[PDB]
Amino acid sequence: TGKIVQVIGAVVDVEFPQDAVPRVYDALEVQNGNERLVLEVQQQLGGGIVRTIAMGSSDGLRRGLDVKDLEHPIEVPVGKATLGRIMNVLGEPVDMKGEIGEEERWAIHRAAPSYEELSNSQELLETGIKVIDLMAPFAKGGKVGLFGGAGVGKTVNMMELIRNIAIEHSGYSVFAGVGERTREGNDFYHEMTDSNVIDKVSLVYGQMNEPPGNRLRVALTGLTMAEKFRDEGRDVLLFVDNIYRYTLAGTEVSALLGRMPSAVGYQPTLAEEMGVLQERITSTKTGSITSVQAVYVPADDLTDPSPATTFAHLDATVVLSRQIASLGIYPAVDPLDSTSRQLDPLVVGQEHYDTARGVQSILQRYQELKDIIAILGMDELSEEDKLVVARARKIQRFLSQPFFVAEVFTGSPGKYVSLKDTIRGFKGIMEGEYDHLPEQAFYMVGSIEEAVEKAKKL
Template sequence: MPCSSILQVVDLLAPYQRGGKIGLFGGAGVGKTVLIMELINNVAKAHGWSLRDESKCALVYGQMNEPPGAGARARVGLTGLTVAEHFRDAEGQDVLLFIDNIFRFTQANSEAIYVPADDLTDPAPATTFAHLDATTVLSRQISELGIYPAVDPLDSTSRMLSPHVLGEEHYNTAPVVQKVLQNYKNLQDIIAILGMDELSEDDKLTVARARKIQRFLSQPFHVAEVFTGAPGKYVELKESVNSFQGVLDGKYDDLLEQSVYMVGGIEEVIAKAEKIAKESAS
């Protein structure tokens, strides 16, 4: 059963499984901590907002200056797991457990995992892949484009991508979105050397739609409002699927790229496009 994160790029292309294990992979400075904070915010408000006055948080600390082997750093992960199991088994609750990060735990003795030099083949992340139900990979290249969350839609994976779990519409949309992005990636070397003018009309259309998809996968975070000044947005899965299917079908080919950047649902995209058009006309 999928667990909605209310993040378009995750729910559409690499959905999380309720009760599953998720790996969050990324190098330093690409937004892992902010993404974790937003996931906590979204899941807490979406699934437990009616209980906001009751304490549902337990914090376990192992300080970096403590002895790693026999001290708290080696035990803090197991202690946190025990607390989570208590809430699940004794109180019958759905529990969201974050370990940030599991590589330091293994050194001492998301899952959020630090990826040395952005290398996913490093033993730290590579040995973890087989144990996970979903992987969310953060890309420095996407981060440098100013697209957040900087989730790589091609490297991120999920075992939930099945028509029996997600439904036919979602299952049919996600691979096509990834195919368009992959085709764009394959064309980038040609564009860099020869320019857009040397592409066929079909390839130009692929590039235009891929760039819209890439920017539409961005989403303002609630926990980042104090830094960006932009209000956070929730986007439900059904709305995401319908919106991206519309992009694939060419319904929004006439919209500018900036109209799909850092917005919520497709209605906000259309409203932003109209605003940009009015400003340009004046």
């Protein structure tokens, strides 16, 4: 009942009778030859025209095609039936198994839970990772975000967190792949299926091959399933593969929607497009969502508008840096920028807090000396600044850890370090009780006993 009148890249303009014009976010449909293309309308221009984004390849669309107005938004299968199966942004099944036997379908555009319904939790969550749960511990039902440039470790860290939190956790889990490699999606799907945990994980994948509309709405498609599991009273894990692609897909389409560019070419609605999503991924009095989000930062610029606007939406922020990875120190977490809302004397006790702040103070004091060391060499340091520097380097080594998901890289077996077992090691290194050991005795070990034991072999 409508006609296409323009096709610019991924956005399509359709003309409808004056009395039948679709509402915003309603989904239309077009027979793109031997295909069916779904359009989601974004704007009601004047005069019966409506401007839409194509959820599929735009190539091959003629002008004057006839489009059919489905009178409901995009709607996805949801609930227990969607568990262990891979789905499109449109909720269609993408693995070769049969239809999804869903009972109920939900629209992917929803309002955030009221301020009245929220809940807060002090209950700490323990992970096998020394640096994370020393410098930036995070709590059940809260948000975590891994910030990093290209290729510094924010996917390996998320697979380790999956291994350390998600297998040892009873409730369901959801993994949304937003604009990342399909190779990794296949690898993860087969790891899960071969370890027989796939029947507890729901997978939505909108990877980098797909056109902008899929990358734009796949994150909402995943949040909708996480929200269904939440409202059933359960408690859920939600892993998002790269949330930056969700705003990049909006930047790609913004100018075609006819909107003036903002600071660095970003859409003018960047902060709202980002908040309207991240405000509904939260725990509530009826159930809780614990979420880990990888956040790409372009050109390693932590002040680019997108990471800068993302920082405010997270409880624990872990910042990965290339200048640490190039030293071979993995995970390449920057401990002078990682932080957590949970790091308080009231929440983690006085000993944990005091050790964390001591580590920060030593490492910052070491940063302050790096220029004088660069110009005048290390022999010009006072006799105790040399001690500060040696302990700082030992701590830098000791934050490294081997991971079970990195055996493919280094061969060394993974290590799981309990919190009680790491604040003791750092108290030791700081108080001076391990000055005798060489620096390389701390590199890529688990507990501190492994370091004193490694020193015996040099």
